[PDB]
Design a protein around this ligand. Structure first.
Ligand SMILES: Nc1nc2c(ncn2[C@@H]2O[C@H](COP(=O)(O)OP(=O)(O)OP(=O)(O)O)[C@@H](O)[C@H]2O)c(=O)[nH]1
Ligand SMILES: Nc1ncnc2c1ncn2[C@@H]1O[C@H](COP(=O)(O)OP(=O)(O)CP(=O)(O)O)[C@@H](O)[C@H]1O
Ligand SMILES: Nc1cc(C(F)(F)F)c(-c2cc(N3CCOCC3)nc(N3CCCC3)n2)cn1
Ligand SMILES: Nc1nc2c(ncn2[C@@H]2O[C@H](COP(=O)(O)OP(=O)(O)O)[C@@H](O)[C@H]2O)c(=O)[nH]1
Ligand SMILES: [Ca+2]
Ligand SMILES: [Ca+2]
Ligand SMILES: [Ca+2]
Ligand SMILES: [Ca+2]
Ligand SMILES: [Mg+2]
Ligand SMILES: [Mg+2]
Ligand SMILES: [Mg+2]
Lengths: 54, 344, 423, 438
C-alpha cells in the first residue's frame, strides 16, 4: 500500500494510494437526418390532407 | 394479500412451497413475468437479480442468494477454500483438491502426487465436475496420468480431489455412505440446520481393489438404481444414531454433528460479506444441500455444497413447511424443526 | 397554452353549460365574468379556458353550436348565460331531427363555415393553442353528425393540434328515438379517425348510478348532467391548476394512447353519495376503481387496463395515496397489461371541488370498453339487417354502403380491443 | 485558467441547474445580485472560480451557463426567482410548446427549429473564453426535451467544438418520481445517439435520491426541491475541483483519464456520505473511516446496484472538510480487508484521493445538516450495468407490441431507429459483461 503523487495547497491536498499492481457525423449528415424526418412528417400530413379532401 | 411468481418449474422443493403458500388463502400466484410480486421463486440459472427491488411499494424477496454459486460450484469451492484466509490452505475438513483445465493447478497436483507415489502412501484420487450432472463424468484412479487424459477428453473444468480411502463402513454390508444436511439461510443471515438429514448409502460392499466398478464407490441415489438394508438406500438420523450407539458406543451428535455444524458455519460465515442482503434493496434466502463423508476415525469431511437441492421424499412436507415459517412468513406474516447455528 | 371549447347540439350544450358553471365556480368567476376568488392558484392557469376582456373580466373560450335555437336560448337564460361571448353563439333554425345525415351532410353543412369562422377567431388570439375539446352526444343529429363534421373540418385546418371529445353514448334505457344506434355508429367511425382522446360517457351508466347508487327513483337529464360536469371538472383538473407534472393535452394523449385507434376512455368519479361524512383515502381509492363508479357501462374485470390516470383532489396524505394506489393494483394485478410498465399514474391537486373536502377522478383506457361498442353494434345490426328506419337517411342522400362501412369499422375496433386484451 | 460552460436542458436540467448555481454562489461568497465582496480583482481575473463565472466591469459574477427548455414555465421561474439578477437574458432560452415526453419531437420536430439559436447563444459564451475546456450538460433521460433535444445538441457540439470535452449529469427515470410511461423509450434513444459524444456521464437514478431523502432526511414525500438540493451537493462535490485550487480532476480531460479506460463504458457510479437531517437536533459527527465505509453501502449510491458483484476499473474519493491523508489510508486499509472490492486484472487496485478543506456548504433553511466532513466516491464499476438491464427490459416489454411507437413515427422518426438504439444498448450490456464477469 504505497502513497504517490502527494500535492498540497492551502485549499486541500490530493494523492494516489495503490493497493496492488495490475496482473464523428458531419454537419451535413446531421442536417440530412433532420430534413429526412421533416419530409416524412410532410408526407404523412399530405396523405392526411388528401384523405380529408376525399 | 401477498403475491409470488414461479420461475423454476423443475423444483420439487418449491413446487411444494408454492402449494403451501396457495393453501393459506393469503398468497396469490401471478404469471412468470409479472413484476409486481412480493416473492420470487427464481430460475436456477441467469436469475435477474438486477431487476429486483425497484418496484415502488413492494417488499421483494427471492429464494436465491446472488453470489452463492461461489460455494456451490466445485471449481470455485476449491478456490474459495484455498484463498479465503478464514478457511485458509490450513483447512482440515476438506480433502486435498486441485482445479484442472483441459489459475490452473496441473503442476502442483503432480507435485503432491509425486510425494505420495514416492511415499507409497495411498495415492487414489477422484476427478469430477459440477458439469457432470447426476452420475456422469466421474473417474477414480490410482494413477495420476490416467486421471488427466479423462479430463482432456471432456471440454470442461474438473476438480481432482483425494479419494477418501478409509471411509466409515456401515455393518452389515461393509458399505459406503454419505450424509446430506439441509441448511436454510434467511434474509437476516440466520443459519438454520434442518433437524433431519439423510444418509445416502451404497447397496454393495466397499471394494478397495478395483475402482473400475463405480457402484460401491459412488453413493449417489441415481447410481444405486438395491434397497435390501433400507428403503431406497436412505437411512435417517434416528437409525444411524442408534447404530453408532450400538456399534461404536457414541452418538450422532458427538461423533459427527458437531463437525457438520462447524463446517456449515465456517463456509457460510466466510461468504457472508459478499452475499448478505442486509441493507440491500431486495432480500434473499436460500436452501442449501451440504454433502459430507465420514472416515473410519469418525472425522467428517465436506464433499460439496448443492445450491438447488432436492429433498428426501418423507421429509418434503416438514422441511417445505419450515421454509414457509422461517424464510417467507418472517418477512410476509399471515393473519422448531431447525437448529439455529449461532454466529458473529 | 389555450384550449378552445366547442359544444354542439342539445346534449352537448346542456352538459357544456354545466361544465362552465362548475369550473367558473372553482376558479372564482361569478356569472358576470368577474373574478372574486381568494387564492392565486385560481388565476395561475385560468387562460387555458378563459380569455381576459377589458375591465378584468374573464370570458370562456367557448363556442356554442346548434341547428335549432331552443337549447341555446335556455343557456343564455341560464345561471351563467351572460359569461359567454355573444358572438360565439352559432345556431340555425331547421333542426337536425335526430338524424346524423342532416347534421353531417345537409343542414349541418350550411352552418359549419360560420362555426369555423368563430373557431378561427378564437384560435388566432391564442398565444399557443393546445387543441380543442368538444362536448356532444352521439345519439342525436346535431352533436353527432354536425359535431363530427366539425371535428373533420378542424383537423383539416389545424392538423397538428390535439382533438378531445366528451361523447355521450346512447342507451335504450335513456333513449329519445330508435335511430340512436345508427347515429352513434356513424359517429364512432369519425371519432376513431379524428380524435386523440374520447371520454366515453354512457347514458346507461349515468342512469344506473342515479338509480342504484344515488337512490333517485326518477333521474332526469339534469341529474345525469351533474355526474358529467363533475367528471369533466375532474379530468381537466391537471390542465386547469398549477399542479406539477406539467400536463398539456398532447402529454396526456402520449401517456394514455399506446395505439392510435384505442383512445376511448372509461371515466369514473368518487365520491358519489346519496353528505358531510369524511371520506378517507382508502375509500376514495376503492370507490374510484369500483365498476359502480364508472361512467361507461363496462365491467373492467371483463378486460385489461392499458393505461390509467387517477387524480386526487383535496388535502390528504400523499403517502396514504401512493400506498392505496399500490394496494389496489395488487388486488387487481390481473387487470393491468404486464407489457406496459408503470401504466398507472397518480396525480394530486390541492383544490377540492365545490362542497367536497376530497374527491378522486378515474380515467381508464381499458379493453373492456369493447362492451360499449358491442352493445351499440348489436342494436345497429338488429335494425340494419331489415334496413329499418333507413329512409330517414337515404332521403338525405346517403347510401347503404356508408352504413356498412361504419359497421365494419366499429367491429374492427372491437376485435382490436380483444386482441390486446389477450396479449 | 480554463473555462467550463454549463448547459441545462428541459425541466429536470433547468431545475437542477438552479439548485447547483444557488449552491455555487453560497460556496464562493457570490450574492444573488452577482456581487462577490471577496473578489478584490474587479471586472476580471483568472482565479479558480472564474472557470464557472465571468465578470462584468460592475463586479457582477455571471455564470457561464445556458438554460434551454422548449416551453417557458420552468425557465420563467429562473427569470423571476431569487437569482434573476445573476443571468443575462440571452442565457435563458425558451420555446413555445414542449416535446410532450416524445424524444422524436424534441430531437427532430422542435429540435430542428431551435438548435441554431441555442448554438448561437453558446458561441457567445465561448467567445468570452480564453481557453474553453468544454461543456457540462444537465438533463433527464425521460423528458422529450431532456432526451431528444440534448442528443441533437450533443451531436452539434462535437461538430462545432471537436476538441472539447463533454460531461453529462443525467437523471435516470424512476416511477416513484413523476414519470411518463414512454421514458424507457426516450432513455434508450438518447443514450444511443449521445454515446459517441459524451466523454463521461454521471447517472443519477431518481429512485435512489428519493430513497435517500425518505430514509436519511425523514421526508415522507420528497419534492423536486428536496431531490434537487441533494443532487446539487453531489454535483458540487464532483465539480469542486474545477472551481477551487487543487491537483485532482482539475480539468475535464482528467475525468476521462481517471475514470474511463474504455470510451463506451463512461458511466461512473457516484456514492455520497453523509446525508444527515437538518431537523435532527441531536447529531453525532461521522469520522473519515465511517464516511468512507458508507461509500460501499448500496443505500448511499446515486444508482441502486450491487458493486460486490461487478468489477472496478477506477475509483476516486473526493472529500470535503476536516480530512487528512493519514485517516484516508487508515480507513481504506480497514475497508479492503472487510469488503468485496475486486478490480479488473488489467487495472491497478487503488484510489485517487482528493481533499478540499472547506466543508460542504448547505442551503440555509434546507433539509441537509451542515457536516464537518463529507465524501463523494466516483467508481467505474460494471455493476452499474444493472441499471441498463432494467431499462432495456422495460423497453423490450413495450416495443414487442410497438406500444406508443406511432407517436414517434408521427414526428418523422423511422421505426428502425428503435431497434438500432436497442441493439446499441445490447452491445453496451455485452461490453459490461465482458469486462466484469468471470
Ligand atoms: N431529479 C429531478 N428529476 C426531474 C425534475 N424534473 C423532472 N424530472 C424527471 O425528469 C423526467 C421528466 O422529464 P423532464 O425533464 O421533466 O421533461 P423535459 O426535458 O422538460 O421534456 P418535455 O417532454 O418537453 O417536457 C421524469 O423522469 C422526472 O421524474 C427535477 O427537477 N429533478
Ligand atoms: N474425495 C472423495 N472421497 C471419497 N468419495 C468421494 C469423494 N468425492 C466424491 N465421492 C463420492 O462420489 C459421490 C458423488 O460426488 P459429488 O457429490 O461430488 O457428485 P454430484 O454433485 O454429481 C452428486 P451430489 O449432488 O448428491 O453431491 C459422493 O456421493 C461420494 O460418495
Ligand atoms: N386527464 C388526464 C390526467 C392525467 C394526469 F392527471 F396528469 F395524471 C394524465 C396522465 C398524465 C401523465 N403524465 C406523465 C408525464 O408527465 C406528464 C403527465 N401520465 C399519465 N399516465 C397514464 C398512463 C401512465 C402515464 N396520465 C392523463 N389524462
Ligand atoms: N346525459 C345527457 N344525455 C342527453 C342530454 N340531452 C340529450 N341526451 C342524449 O343525447 C341523445 C340525443 O341527442 P341530442 O343531443 O338531444 O340531439 P342533437 O341536438 O341533435 O345533438 C340521446 O342519446 C339522449 O339520451 C343531456 O342533457 N344529458
Ligand atoms: Ca336550407
Ligand atoms: Ca367562409
Ligand atoms: Ca476577479
Ligand atoms: Ca467527441
Ligand atoms: Mg452436485
Ligand atoms: Mg334532443
Ligand atoms: Mg418540460
Amino acid at each position: 500500500m504505497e502513497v504517490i503523487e502527494l500535492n498540497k495547497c492551502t485549499s486541500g491536498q490530493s494523492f494516489e494510494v495503490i493497493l496492488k499492481p495490475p496482473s464523428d457525423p458531419s454537419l451535413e449528415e446531421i442536417q440530412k437526418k433532420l430534413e429526412a424526418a421533416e419530409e416524412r412528417r410532410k408526407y404523412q400530413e399530405a396523405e392526411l390532407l388528401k384523405h380529408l379532401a376525399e | 394479500m401477498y403475491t409470488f411468481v414461479v420461475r423454476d418449474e423443475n423444483s420439487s422443493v418449491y413446487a411444494e412451497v408454492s402449494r403451501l403458500l396457495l393453501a393459506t388463502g393469503q398468497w396469490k400466484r401471478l404469471r412468470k413475468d409479472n413484476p409486481r410480486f412480493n416473492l420470487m421463486l427464481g430460475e436456477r440459472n441467469r436469475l435477474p437479480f438486477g431487476r429486483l427491488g425497484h418496484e415502488p411499494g413492494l417488499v421483494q424477496l427471492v429464494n436465491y442468494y446472488r453470489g452463492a454459486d461461489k460455494l456451490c460450484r466445485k471449481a470455485s469451492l476449491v478456490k474459495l477454500i484455498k484463498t479465503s484466509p478464514e478457511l485458509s490452505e490450513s483447512c482440515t475438513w476438506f480433502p486435498e483438491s486441485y482445479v484442472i483445465y483441459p489459475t490452473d493447478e496441473r503442476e502442483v497436483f503432480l507435485a503432491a502426487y509425486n510425494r505420495r507415489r514416492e511415499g507409497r502412501e495411498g495415492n487414489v484420487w477422484i476427478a469430477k465436475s459440477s458439469a457432470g450432472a447426476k452420475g456422469e463424468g466421474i473417474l477414480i484412479s490410482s494413477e495420476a496420468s490416467e486421471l488427466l487424459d479423462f479430463i482432456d477428453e471432456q471440454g470442461q473444468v474438473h476438480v481432482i480431489q483425494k479419494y477418501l480411502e478409509k471411509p466409515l463402513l456401515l455393518e452389515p454390508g461393509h458399505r459406503k455412505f454419505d450424509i446430506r444436511s439441509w441448511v436454510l439461510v434467511d434474509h437476516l443471515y440466520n443459519i438454520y440446520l434442518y433437524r433431519e438429514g439423510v444418509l445416502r448409502t451404497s447397496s454393495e460392499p466397499y471394494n478397495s481393489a478395483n475402482f473400475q466398478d463405480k457402484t460401491c464407490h459412488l453413493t449417489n441415489h441415481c447410481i444405486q438404481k438395491y434397497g435390501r438394508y433400507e428403503e431406497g438406500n436412505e437411512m435417517f438420523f434416528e437409525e444411524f444414531n442408534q447404530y453408532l450407539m450400538d456399534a461404536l458406543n457414541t452418538t450422532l451428535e458427538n461423533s459427527i454433528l458437531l463437525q457438520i455444524k462447524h463446517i456449515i458455519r465456517s463456509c457460510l460465515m466466510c461468504i457472508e460479506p459478499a452475499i448478505s442482503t442486509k441493507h440491500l434493496h431486495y432480500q434473499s434466502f436460500q436452501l442449501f444441500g451440504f454433502d459430507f463423508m465420514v472416515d473410519e476415525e469418525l472425522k467428517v469431511w465436506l464433499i460439496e455444497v448443492n445450491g438447488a437441492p432436492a429433498c428426501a421424499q418423507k421429509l418434503y412436507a416438514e422441511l417445505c413447511q419450515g421454509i414457509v415459517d422461517v424464510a417467507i412468513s418472517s418477512v410476509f406474516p399471515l393473519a422448531s424443526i431447525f437448529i439455529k447455528l449461532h454466529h458473529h | 397554452r389555450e384550449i378552445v371549447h366547442i359544444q354542439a347540439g342539445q346534449c352537448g350544450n346542456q352538459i357544456g353549460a354545466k361544465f362552465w358553471e362548475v369550473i367558473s365556480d372553482e376558479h372564482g368567476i361569478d356569472p358576470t365574468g368577474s373574478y372574486h376568488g381568494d387564492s392565486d392558484l385560481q388565476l395561475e392557469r385560468i387562460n387555458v379556458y378563459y380569455n381576459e376582456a377589458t375591465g378584468n373580466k374573464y370570458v370562456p373560450r367557448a363556442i356554442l353550436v346548434d341547428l335549432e335555437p331552443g337549447t341555446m336560448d335556455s343557456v343564455r337564460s341560464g345561471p351563467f348565460g351572460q359569461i359567454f361571448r355573444p358572438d360565439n353563439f352559432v345556431f340555425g333554425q331547421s333542426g337536425a331531427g335526430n338524424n346524423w345525415a342532416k347534421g353531417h351532410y345537409t343542414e349541418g353543412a350550411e352552418l359549419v363555415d360560420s362555426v369555423l369562422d368563430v373557431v378561427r377567431k378564437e384560435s388566432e388570439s391564442c398565444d399557443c393553442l393546445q387543441g380543442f375539446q368538444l362536448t356532444h352526444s352521439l345519439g342525436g343529429g346535431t352533436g353527432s353528425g354536425m359535431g363530427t363534421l366539425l371535428i373533420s373540418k378542424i383537423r383539416e385546418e389545424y392538423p397538428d393540434r390535439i382533438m378531445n371529445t366528451f361523447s355521450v353514448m346512447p342507451s335504450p334505457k335513456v333513449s329519445d328515438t330508435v335511430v340512436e344506434p345508427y347515429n352513434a355508429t356513424l359517429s364512432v367511425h369519425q371519432l376513431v379517425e379524428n380524435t386523440d382522446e374520447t371520454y366515453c360517457i354512457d347514458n346507461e351508466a349515468l342512469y344506473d348510478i342515479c338509480f342504484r347508487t344515488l337512490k333517485l327513483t326518477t333521474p332526469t337529464y339534469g341529474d345525469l348532467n351533474h355526474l358529467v360536469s363533475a367528471t369533466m371538472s375532474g379530468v381537466t383538473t391537471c390542465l386547469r391548476f398549477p399542479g406539477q407534472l406539467n400536463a398539456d393535452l398532447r402529454k396526456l394523449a402520449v401517456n394514455m394512447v399506446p395505439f392510435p385507434r384505442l383512445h376511448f376512455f372509461m371515466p369514473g368519479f368518487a365520491p358519489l353519495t346519496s353528505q358531510y361524512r369524511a371520506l378517507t383515502v382508502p375509500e376514495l381509492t376503492q370507490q374510484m376503481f369500483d365498476s359502480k363508479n364508472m361512467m361507461a357501462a363496462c365491467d373492467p374485470r371483463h378486460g385489461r387496463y392499458l393505461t390509467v390516470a387517477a387524480i386526487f383532489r383535496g388535502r390528504m396524505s400523499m403517502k396514504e395515496v401512493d400506498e392505496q394506489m399500490l394496494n389496489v393494483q395488487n388486488k387487481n394485478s390481473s387487470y393491468f397489461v404486464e407489457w406496459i410498465p408503470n401504466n398507472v399514474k397518480t396525480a394530486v391537486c390541492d383544490i377540492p371541488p365545490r362542497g367536497l373536502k376530497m374527491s378522486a377522478t378515474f380515467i381508464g383506457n381499458s379493453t373492456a370498453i369493447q362492451e360499449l361498442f358491442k352493445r351499440i353494434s348489436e342494436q345497429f345490426t338488429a335494425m340494419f339487417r331489415r334496413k329499418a328506419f333507413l329512409h330517414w337517411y337515404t332521403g338525405e342522400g346517403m347510401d347503404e354502403m356508408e352504413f356498412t362501412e361504419a359497421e365494419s369499422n366499429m367491429n374492427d375496433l372491437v376485435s382490436e380491443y380483444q386482441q390486446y386484451q389477450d396479449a | 485558467m480554463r473555462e467550463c460552460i454549463s448547459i441545462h436542458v428541459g425541466q429536470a436540467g433547468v431545475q437542477i441547474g438552479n439548485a447547483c448555481w444557488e449552491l455555487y454562489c453560497l460556496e464562493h461568497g457570490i450574492q444573488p445580485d452577482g456581487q462577490m465582496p471577496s473578489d478584490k480583482t474587479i471586472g476580471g481575473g483568472d482565479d479558480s472560480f472564474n472557470t464557472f463565472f465571468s465578470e462584468t466591469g460592475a463586479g457582477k459574477h455571471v455564470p457561464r451557463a445556458v438554460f434551454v427548455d422548449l416551453e417557458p414555465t420552468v425557465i420563467d421561474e429562473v427569470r423571476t426567482g431569487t437569482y434573476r439578477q445573476l443571468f443575462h437574458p440571452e442565457q435563458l432560452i425558451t420555446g413555445k410548446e414542449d416535446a410532450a415526453n416524445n424524444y422524436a419531437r424534441g430531437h427532430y420536430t422542435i429540435g430542428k427549429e431551435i438548435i441554431d439559436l441555442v448554438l448561437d447563444r453558446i458561441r457567445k459564451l465561448a467567445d468570452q473564453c480564453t481557453g474553453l475546456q468544454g461543456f457540462l450538460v444537465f438533463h433527464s433521460f425521460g423528458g422529450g426535451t431532456g432526451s431528444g433535444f440534448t442528443s441533437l445538441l450533443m451531436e452539434r457540439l462535437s461538430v462545432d467544438y471537436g476538441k472539447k470535452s463533454k460531461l453529462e449529469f443525467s437523471i435516470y427515470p424512476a416511477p416513484q418520481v413523476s414519470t411518463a410511461v414512454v421514458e424507457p423509450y426516450n432513455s434508450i434513444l438518447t443514450t444511443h445517439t449521445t454515446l459517441e459524444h459524451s466523454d463521461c456521464a454521471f447517472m443519477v437514478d431518481n429512485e435512489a435520491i428519493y430513497d435517500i431523502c425518505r430514509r436519511n432526511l425523514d421526508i415522507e414525500r420528497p419534492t423536486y426541491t428536496n431531490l434537487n438540493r441533494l443532487i446539487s451537493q453531489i454535483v458540487s462535490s464532483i465539480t469542486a475541483s474545477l472551481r477551487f485550487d487543487g491537483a485532482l480532476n482539475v480539468d475535464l480531460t482528467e475525468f476521462q483519464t481517471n475514470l474511463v479506460p474504455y470510451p463506451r463504458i463512461h458511466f461512473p457510479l457516484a456514492t455520497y456520505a453523509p446525508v444527515i437531517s437538518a431537523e435532527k437536533a441531536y447529531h453525532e459527527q461521522l469520522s473519515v473511516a465511517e464516511i468512507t465505509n458508507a461509500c460501499f453501502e448500496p443505500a448511499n449510491q446515486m444508482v441502486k446496484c450491487d458493486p460486490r458483484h461487478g468489477k472496478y476499473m477506477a475509483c476516486c474519493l473526493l472529500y470535503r472538510g476536516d480530512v487528512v491523508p493519514k485517516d484516508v489510508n487508515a480507513a481504506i486499509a480497514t475497508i479492503k480487508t472487510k469488503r468485496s472490492i475486486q478490480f479488473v486484472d488489467w487495472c491497478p487496485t487503488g484510489f485517487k484521493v482528493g481533499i478540499n478543506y472547506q466543508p460542504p456548504t448547505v442551503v440555509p433553511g434546507g433539509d441537509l445538516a451542515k457536516v464537518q466532513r463529507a465524501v463523494c466516491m466516483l467508481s467505474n464499476t460494471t455493476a452499474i450495468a444493472e441499471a441498463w438491464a432494467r431499462l432495456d427490459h422495460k423497453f423490450d416489454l413495450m416495443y414487442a407490441k410497438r406500444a406508443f411507437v406511432h407517436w414517434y413515427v408521427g414526428e418523422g422518426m423511422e421505426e428502425g431507429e428503435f431497434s438500432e438504439a436497442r441493439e446499441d444498448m445490447a452491445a453496451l450490456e455485452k461490453d459490461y459483461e465482458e469486462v466484469g464477469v468471470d
